C-alpha cells in the first residue's frame, strides 16, 4: 500500500485550523473499522498517538484534534491550533503492513520577529591548538527563512562555514540559527575585520555583527 | 504503568550486525504483538516487524525493507537481530506495544536506541566557551566528536530559559554543534556561567566556564 499525506508543509495562525490529508492507493476500511492513525512527533521524542481507527481521540488528547473519512481519503483537522502543535504529523495504516505517511511539518505563525545576533571571536584555547572558529548567534526570529554571509576585510568566505538551524520553538513559535567560520589559526591571525551579514525579511538591509582582530 | 526501553544501540560499522533489546513492563507481554519502527534523521518513520503474541504462535512478519533483520523475544524483553548493516540503516530504533485484544497498537513506544552505521571512529569533543568579544549571549562551540549524541546544559540546569542548542551538523566524519544562553546583564561577568557538555560515547564531560576576556 501507499500514503500519500499531504501537504508535506504548513503554516496555521494561533487558533485558525490545520487540516491534513492522508491519502491510500486502496481502502482500509474493513466492515467495521478504518485502519488510520495520526501521530504528533515533536523533537527528540517518539511519535504520539493522536487518532485511532480514523476518528477517535485517543485518551487525554486535547478535543482540537478531530480526524475523519474512510475507505482512501482521511484527513486530520486541529482547530483551534495552539503553540505548542508546532511538529510533525503522520498518518499510518494501522494493520497489515502497518505502512506511515511521509509527514507533515506543521507550523504555528506569529508576528514577525527581528534575529537578535552575536558575533564571538575564536577562544583562547582553541587558537592554543591551532584552530579558529568564529560564531555568531541569530536568535528568537521570525519567518524561517533567513540568508547569512561570512566576510573576512570584506572578502566573503564559505568554504568552512558550518551552519545549523533549531525547529521552530514549541513555546513562543521563533526560530534560530547557528553559524561557524572554521579557519586555521595562520589565516584568522592575517587578518583584521570578521563580519557576520543576516538578510531576513524584518529589515530591507543586512543585519551585520562585527568585530576586529586587532582591537581585541 | 506501561513501560518499554530500548538497549543495545550504538556506534557500528558498515557489514556489521547488531541485536538490540527492548525491555517491557506493566503488562501481560505474552498477550501483546511487538513491532520495531526506525526513523533516520530529519526523516520519517519506519515499520520495520513485529512479533506475534502467544494466541498467535510467536510468528513474526517484516516489512519489505528489511524481510536481513529478526524480531525475538523473552517470555519480558523483545529482540532485534540486524545484518549486513548499511548506511541507510542509521536511525533511532524504536520498540512499539502494537495489538492485543482491542487495546490501540502504538500508543506506547520506547524511548528509543540511536543506531550509527560508520566506519570513523569514536572521538571526544573539544569544548570552546564563546564570550563576547541589557541581556548578553554567551555559548559554547562543542567540536570534533563522534558519533552522536551530546548533551549541553548551562549552569548544571539552573539557567533553563533562553538556551539555545543547535542541531549537531556532520563535516568529514567530525560532528560539530553550539549552544547559546541569553543571561541578565546582571548575571554575568558578576557571577560564573557555565556550560556542561557531556558525550557518553567516549566517557567524556567537560564544564567549561565563560570567562569575560
Ligand atoms: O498478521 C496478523 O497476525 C494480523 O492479525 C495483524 C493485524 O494487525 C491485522 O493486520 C491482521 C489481518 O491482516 C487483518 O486484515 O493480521
Known amino acids: 500500500i501507499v500514503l500519500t499525506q499531504s501537504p508535506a508543509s504548513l503554516a496555521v495562525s494561533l487558533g485558525q485550523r490545520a487540516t491534513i490529508s492522508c491519502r491510500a492507493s486502496k481502502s482500509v476500511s474493513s466492515s467495521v473499522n478504518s485502519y488510520m492513525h495520526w501521530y504528533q512527533q515533536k523533537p527528540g521524542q517518539p511519535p504520539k498517538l493522536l487518532i485511532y481507527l480514523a476518528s477517535n481521540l485517543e485518551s487525554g488528547v486535547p478535543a482540537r484534534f478531530s480526524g475523519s473519512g474512510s475507505g482512501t481519503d482521511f484527513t486530520l483537522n486541529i482547530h483551534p491550533v495552539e503553540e505548542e502543535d508546532a511538529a510533525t504529523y503522520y498518518c499510518?495504516?494501522?494493520?497489515?503492513?502497518?505502512?506511515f505517511g511521509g509527514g507533515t511539518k506543521l507550523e504555528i505563525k506569529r508576528a514577525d520577529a527581528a534575529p537578535t545576533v552575536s558575533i564571538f571571536p575564536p577562544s583562547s584555547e582553541q587558537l592554543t591548538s591551532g584552530g579558529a572558529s568564529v560564531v555568531c548567534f541569530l536568535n528568537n526570529f521570525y519567518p524561517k527563512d533567513i540568508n547569512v554571509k561570512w566576510k573576512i576585510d570584506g572578502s566573503e568566505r564559505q568554504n568552512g562555514v558550518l551552519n545549523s538551524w533549531t525547529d521552530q520553538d514549541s513555546k513562543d513559535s521563533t526560530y534560530s540559527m547557528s553559524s561557524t567560520l572554521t579557519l586555521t589559526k595562520d589565516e584568522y591571525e592575517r587578518h583584521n575585520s570578521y563580519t557576520c551579514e543576516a538578510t531576513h525579511k524584518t529589515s530591507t538591509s543586512p543585519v551585520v555583527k562585527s568585530f576586529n582582530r586587532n582591537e581585541c | 504503568e506501561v513501560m518499554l526501553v530500548e538497549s543495545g544501540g550504538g556506534l557500528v560499522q558498515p557489514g556489521g550486525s547488531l541485536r538490540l533489546s527492548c525491555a517491557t513492563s506493566g503488562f501481560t507481554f505474552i498477550d501483546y504483538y511487538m513491532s520495531w519502527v526506525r526513523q533516520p534523521p530529519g526523516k520519517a518513520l519506519e515499520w520495520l516487524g513485529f512479533i506475534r503474541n502467544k494466541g498467535n504462535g510467536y510468528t513474526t512478519e517484516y516489512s519489505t525493507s528489511v524481510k536481513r533483520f529478526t524480531i525475538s523475544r523473552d517470555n519480558s524483553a523483545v529482540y532485534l537481530q540486524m545484518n549486513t548493516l548499511r548506511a541507510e540503516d542509521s536511525a533511532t530504533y524504536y520498540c512499539?506495544?502494537?495489538?492485543?485484544?482491542?487495546?490501540?497498537?502504538?500508543?506506547?513506544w520506547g524511548q528509543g536506541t540511536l543506531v550509527t552505521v560508520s566506519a570513523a571512529s569514536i572521538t571526544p569533543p573539544s569544548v570552546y566557551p564563546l564570550a563576547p568579544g541589557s541581556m548578553v549571549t554567551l555559548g559554547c562551540l562543542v567540536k570534533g566528536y563522534f558519533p552522536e549524541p551530546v548533551t549541553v546544559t548551562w549552569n548544571s540546569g539552573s539557567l533553563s530559559s533562553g538556551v539555545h542548542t543547535f542541531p549537531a551538523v556532520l563535516q568529514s566524519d567530525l560532528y560539530t554543534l553550539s549552544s547559546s544562553v541569553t543571561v541578565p546583564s546582571s548575571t554575568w561577568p558578576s557571577e560564573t556561567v557555565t556550560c556542561n557538555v557531556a558525550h557518553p560515547a567516549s566517557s567524556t564531560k567537560v564544564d567549561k566556564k565563560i570567562v569575560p576576556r
Open positions: 512499539a506495544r502494537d495489538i492485543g485484544y482491542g487495546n490501540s497498537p502504538f500508543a506506547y
Open positions: 499510518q495504516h494501522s494493520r497489515e503492513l502497518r505502512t
